[PDB]
Amino acid sequence: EKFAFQAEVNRMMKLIINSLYKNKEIFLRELISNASDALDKIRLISLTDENALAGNEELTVKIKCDKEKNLLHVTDTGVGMTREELVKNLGTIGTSEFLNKMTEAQESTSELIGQFGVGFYSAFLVADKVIVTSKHNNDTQHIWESDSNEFSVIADPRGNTLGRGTTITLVLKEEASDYLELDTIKNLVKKYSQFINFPIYVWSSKTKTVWDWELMN
Ligand SMILES: CCNC(=O)[C@H]1O[C@@H](n2cnc3c(N)ncnc32)[C@H](O)[C@@H]1O
Numbered sequence: 001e002k003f004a005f006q007a008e009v010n011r012m013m014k015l016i017i018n019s020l021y022k023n024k025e026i027f028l029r030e031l032i033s034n035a036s037d038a039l040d041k042i043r044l045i046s047l048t049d050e051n052a053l054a055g056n057e058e059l060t061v062k063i064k065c066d067k068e069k070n071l072l073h074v075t076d077t078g079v080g081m082t083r084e085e086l087v088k089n090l091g092t093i094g095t096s097e098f099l100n101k102m103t104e105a106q107e108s109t110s111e112l113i114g115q116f117g118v119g120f121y122s123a124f125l126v127a128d129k130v131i132v133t134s135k136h137n138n139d140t141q142h143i144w145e146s147d148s149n150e151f152s153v154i155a156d157p158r159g160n161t162l163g164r165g166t167t168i169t170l171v172l173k174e175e176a177s178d179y180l181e182l183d184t185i186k187n188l189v190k191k192y193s194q195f196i197n198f199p200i201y202v203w204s205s206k207t208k209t210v211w212d213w214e215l216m217n
Contacts, residue, residue, distance in 0.1 A: 002152045006092045011099065013121045013148055016113060019106045020122055024176075026110055027126055028185075029192040030119025031074045031168050032200065035061045038078025038166060039198045045079065055080075055137055055164030061196070062213060063189060064203035067180040072127075075167040076198075080136035086144040086153050090120065090132065120168075124148055126179060127170035135162035186216065193217040 005013070020026060039059050046052040053059075056077045064073045081089065098116045102109050113119050123130045132144040133156060141156040178184045182204055193200040193216050201213035 001154055002150060003087060003091050004150055005146075005148075008093050008095060008099070009091065009121075012093060012102075012118060013124060015099070015102045015106070016109075016118065016121045017125055019102065019109045020113070020125055023108075023110055024122075024125045025179075025188055026113070026119075027122040027124075027170075028074075028179075028188045030114060030122050032061065032189070032192050032196060033114060034120060035074060035076035035078060035166070036196045036198060038076050038080070041079040042077075042164070052137065053164075055135065055160075056162070059198055061193075061198055061200040062203065063185065063201070065180050065182060065185060070172050070177070070180065072170045072172060072179055072185075073167055074170075075162070075165060077163070077165040080162070080164050080166055081132075081134040081142075082136045082139040083142045083153055083155075084139075085136065086132060086134060086142055090144060090146075091151055093118070123168065123170055126173055126176035128173050129171035131169040131171070132166060133162065133169065134166040135160055135164050137164060186214075189216050 042052060043059065058077050061076045094116065101112060105112060113122060129145060129147050135141040141160050141162060142153055143156050144151060144153045172179060186202055189200060189202050196217060200216045202216055203211060204214040205211050
């Protein structure tokens with residue numbers, strides 16, 4: 001259940017965190033970009049697999065703020081991940097070139113992070129803990145969590161609650177509490193969803209005060 005990150009991943013997490021220090025809100029752009037890719041994959045599968053979308057008939061990205069819990073949630077209904085995939089895909093990693101590319105560019109990698117497929121780690125810039133709950137058609141719902149010093153994966157004792165997809169839950173750092181603010185979230189989600197071809201909603205409030213999904217693109 002408990003794993004260590006690959007040496008290269010530790011170096012990469014540090015690089016990413018060190019360079020994006022001043023431009024932190026791109027973590028949201030990167031997570032949204034990953035959710036898009038997840039949806040594209042499931043959509044490509046729905047073409048050859050008639051049952052692919054069985055677990056969840058929708059193809060969306062929903063974001064919600066839990067200010068009391070101090071949590072940020074980014075859930076997609078994409079391909080999702082198996083237990084093995086959570087361990088390999090997040091715990092392991094043009095890797096060597098990217099390393100030299102990043103260092104020589106820090107001595108704006110904001111674009112070089114999205115280029116390569118490692119924007120997920122940028123979450124650690126605003127979170128102390130990152131939790132990945134995911135449901136894949138060929139496995140049971142699992143949870144991956146890490147504070148960057150190690151990571152573990154277990155079976156979700158809650159069972160299949162997603163159907164299919166992934167929820168990225170970020171335990172926000174104290175100085176990152178502005179991201180629990182709906183409007184701070186909407187400005188960032190409306191800015192980073194304008195290129196995404198799947199609908200992105202933010203659990204917002206309207207006034208008396210009812211809550212519901214508000215589309216962002
Ligand atoms: C190096 C960081 N790891 C990733 O972003 C990879 O992990 C998996 N991943 C990350 N976020 C998601 C997601 N929301 N849905 C599906 N796979 C994901 C993909 O294979 C990514 O390429």
